[PDB]
Amino acid sequence: LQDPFLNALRRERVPVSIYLVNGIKLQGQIESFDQFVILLKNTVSQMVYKHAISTVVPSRPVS
Amino acid sequence: LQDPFLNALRRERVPVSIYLVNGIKLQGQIESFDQFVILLKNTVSQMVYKHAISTVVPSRPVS
Amino acid sequence: LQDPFLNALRRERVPVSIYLVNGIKLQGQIESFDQFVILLKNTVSQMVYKHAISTVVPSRPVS
Amino acid sequence: LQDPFLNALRRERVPVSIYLVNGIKLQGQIESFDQFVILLKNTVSQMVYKHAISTVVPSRPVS
Amino acid sequence: LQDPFLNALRRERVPVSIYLVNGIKLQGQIESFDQFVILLKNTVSQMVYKHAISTVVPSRPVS
Amino acid sequence: LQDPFLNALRRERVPVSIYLVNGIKLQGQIESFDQFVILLKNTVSQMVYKHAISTVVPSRPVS
Numbered sequence: 001l002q003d004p005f006l007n008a009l010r011r012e013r014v015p016v017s018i019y020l021v022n023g024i025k026l027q028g029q030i031e032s033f034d035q036f037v038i039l040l041k042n043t044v045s046q047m048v049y050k051h052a053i054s055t056v057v058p059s060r061p062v063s
Numbered sequence: 064l065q066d067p068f069l070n071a072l073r074r075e076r077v078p079v080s081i082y083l084v085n086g087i088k089l090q091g092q093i094e095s096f097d098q099f100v101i102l103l104k105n106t107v108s109q110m111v112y113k114h115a116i117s118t119v120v121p122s123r124p125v126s
Numbered sequence: 127l128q129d130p131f132l133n134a135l136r137r138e139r140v141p142v143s144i145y146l147v148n149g150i151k152l153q154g155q156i157e158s159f160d161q162f163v164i165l166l167k168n169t170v171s172q173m174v175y176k177h178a179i180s181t182v183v184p185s186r187p188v189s
Numbered sequence: 190l191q192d193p194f195l196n197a198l199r200r201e202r203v204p205v206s207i208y209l210v211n212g213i214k215l216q217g218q219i220e221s222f223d224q225f226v227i228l229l230k231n232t233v234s235q236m237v238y239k240h241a242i243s244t245v246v247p248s249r250p251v252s
Numbered sequence: 253l254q255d256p257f258l259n260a261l262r263r264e265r266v267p268v269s270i271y272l273v274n275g276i277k278l279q280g281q282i283e284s285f286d287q288f289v290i291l292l293k294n295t296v297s298q299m300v301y302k303h304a305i306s307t308v309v310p311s312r313p314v315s
Numbered sequence: 316l317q318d319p320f321l322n323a324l325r326r327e328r329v330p331v332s333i334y335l336v337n338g339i340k341l342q343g344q345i346e347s348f349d350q351f352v353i354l355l356k357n358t359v360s361q362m363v364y365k366h367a368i369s370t371v372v373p374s375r376p377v378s
Contacts, residue, residue: 001097005110020306021115022275023085034253044310047257052273052306054083054115058107064160068173084178086148117146117178121170127223131236147241149211180209180241184233190349194362210367212337243335243367247359272369274338286316296373299320304336304369 006033008062015059021052069096071125078122084115132159134188141185147178195222197251204248210241258285260314267311273304321348323377330374336367 009016010030018026018040028042038048038056072079073093081089081103091105101111101119135142136156144152144166154168164174164182198205199219207215207229217231227237227245261268262282270278270292280294290300290308324331325345333341333355343357353363353371 001095001100001102002110005100005102005108019087021084021273022306023087024271024275024306026307032253037253037257039253039257040307044313045257046307046309047254048307049302049305050112051114051303053112054085054087055089055103055109055111057109061107064158064163064165065173068163068165068171082150084147086150113175114177116175117148117150118152118166118172118174120172124170127221127226127228128236131226131228131234145213147210149213176238177240179238180211180213181215181229181235181237183235187233190347190352190354191362194352194354194360208339210336212339239364240366242364243337243339244341244355244361244363246361250359273336274369276334276338276369278370284316289316289320291316291320292370296376297320298370298372299317300370301365301368303366 006030006038006056009056009058012062014062017057017059018048018053019055019057020048021054069093069101069119072119072121075125077125080120080122081111081116082118082120083111084117132156132164132182135182135184138188140188143183143185144174144179145181145183146174147180195219195227195245198245198247201251203251206246206248207237207242208244208246209237210243258282258290258308261308261310264314266314269309269311270300270305271307271309272300273306321345321353321371324371324373327377329377332372332374333363333368334370334372335363336369 013029026040028040031039031041031045036050039045040048076092089103091103094102094104094108099113102108103111139155152166154166157165157167157171162176165171166174202218215229217229220228220230220234225239228234229237265281278292280292283291283293283297288302291297292300328344341355343355346354346356346360351365354360355363
């Protein structure tokens with residue numbers, strides 16, 4: 001489920017919110033990902049560990 | 064235990080609360096799931112990592 | 127150790143407190159369990175992920 | 190390292206503090222343990238998941 | 253994705269922020285890393301466990 | 316990276332701070348370690364689970 005969901009966000013360059021396990025919300029666009037991290041682009045590319053992610057939320061409906 | 068419990072919620076489209084490991088409560092309907100994530104539908108589909116889930120709670124009894 | 131401890135609680139239908147890793151306390155009776163989840167019955171059955179459990183505490187001595 | 194450290198506490202029945210990953214302190218005596226849980230005896234036996242333990246601290250020096 | 257991202261930061265000795273799963277921000281330069289830890293240099297070398305990292309953020313764009 | 320870093324601290328008996336995933340700071344000297352725990356000596360030996368450690372920080376430069 002992960003790969004198609006993440007690929008749709010990446011491909012359509014949709015703004016997303018990534019909530020971390022502490023409740024902090026990161027925003028930006030999904031640049032790339034593997035089974036361990038997601039690169040999230042805003043002003044810089046920041047590397048997010050999936051193990052610290054609770055939920056990924058598109059800013060608008062994404063098929 | 065997971066798959067039958069989650070499938071019943073999905074199949075009956077019952078509103079559920081998903082509590083995360085930080086105490087945040089997400090609400091909506093179970094769209095689909097695998098061994099790593101749950102897609103939770105409200106206004107958008109958001110992807111929840113199971114490793115960040117503490118408990119899934121049906122809004123009403125579900126056989 | 128887990129299986130006998132949990133089975134005794136289930137079999138004797140003793141009220142228990144399940145503390146989560148965030149400090150939240152859930153209460154009810156152990157309905158069933160596997161190596162990943164515990165079903166905890168109060169008004170509904172809710173599915174608790176063991177990875178988010180810190181401690182399970184019987185309301186009274188349980189052999 | 191775990192097994193000898195925990196066995197010494199168990200064998201000598203020394204009061205210990207078990208701090209959880211949320212900062213909550215549990216107290217009592219080590220009843221038994223495996224690679225997944227520790228049974229901690231105070232008034233009841235409560236089952237503590239090792240994955241939710243940060244540190245185990247003897248109330249006094251223990252060889 | 254991890255190794256090239258981390259190597260670029262290390263090689264260019266760029267100041268970074270490492271956010272932990274509790275929200276605490278550590279700052280300094282990436283000295284070295286393996287699949288388990290990152291050594292982060294400020295006044296001393298401190299060893300950060302990757303399992304406690306949520307995100308690594310460069311202070312400026314880094315190719 | 317872990318073993319040489321931890322061994323240097325142990326061998327030189329340097330005071331260290333061990334920060335846990337909840338932000339609590341433990342202090343003392345590294346007595347011993349394996350892939351699962353670190354024994355941290357202050358007045359008593361306390362056993363710290365590595366999975367609950369975010370960072371280990373020497374009180375002074377340590378080669």
